[PDB]
Amino acid sequence: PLIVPYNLPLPGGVVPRMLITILGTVKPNANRIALDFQRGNDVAFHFNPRFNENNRRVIVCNTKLDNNWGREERQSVFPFESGKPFKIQVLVEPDHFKVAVNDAHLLQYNHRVKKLNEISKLGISGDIDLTSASYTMI
Numbered sequence: 001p002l003i004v005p006y007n008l009p010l011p012g013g014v015v016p017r018m019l020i021t022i023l024g025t026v027k028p029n030a031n032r033i034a035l036d037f038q039r040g041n042d043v044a045f046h047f048n049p050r051f052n053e054n055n056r057r058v059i060v061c062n063t064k065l066d067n068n069w070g071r072e073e074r075q076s077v078f079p080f081e082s083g084k085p086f087k088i089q090v091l092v093e094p095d096h097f098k099v100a101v102n103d104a105h106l107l108q109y110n111h112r113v114k115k116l117n118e119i120s121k122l123g124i125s126g127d128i129d130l131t132s133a134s135y136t137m138i
């Protein structure tokens with residue numbers, strides 16, 4: 001097992017064709033999950049499934065620069081289920097991050113932070129148990 005919050009180092013940051021794979025299980029009474037692609041204390045890409053925001057399931061994606069959150073990107077397609085195993089894949093593409101859950105494409109998030117090499121850490125937090133987190137260039 002892996003400790004949560006988990007820090008997956010990205011020495012030399014993200015680069016196109018980098019495939020990050022995370023394997024785990026959502027906890028039985030999960031409230032939220034978060035992946036944080038960090039550039040120091042800024043968050044180039046925050047991917048946040050909320051099991052209950054205003055009584056609705058939603059994935060909120062955003063960038064935090066200099067302590068302030070920008071323009072939220074929201075989507076109602078929500079494949080995570082409490083108590084069930086998951087596989088998240090994040091494929092870094094030239095102009096966006098592609099996100100797939102359990103081999104099904106979920107969403108993409110266009111790069112706001114364009115200096116990709118400075119996005120040096122992936123924080124993985126929230127209501128999950130984690131078994132694997134790594135990346136391979138494809």
Ligand SMILES: Cc1nnc([C@@H]2O[C@H](CO)[C@H](O)[C@H](n3cc(-c4cc(F)c(Cl)c(F)c4)nn3)[C@H]2O)n1-c1cc(Cl)ccc1C(F)(F)F
Nearest residue numbers: 032033034046048060061062068069070071072125126127
């Ligand atoms: C309203 C509102 N309700 N939530 C948010 C923030 O929305 C952001 C996206 O826009 C991030 O999701 C922030 N966030 C979530 C977490 C996290 C997630 C986890 F799952 C865990 Cl486990 C964990 F510990 C931590 N840390 N920071 C979250 O606090 N905002 C919001 C939205 C905007 Cl655009 C601007 C300002 C706010 C503010 F926070 F000030 F209120």
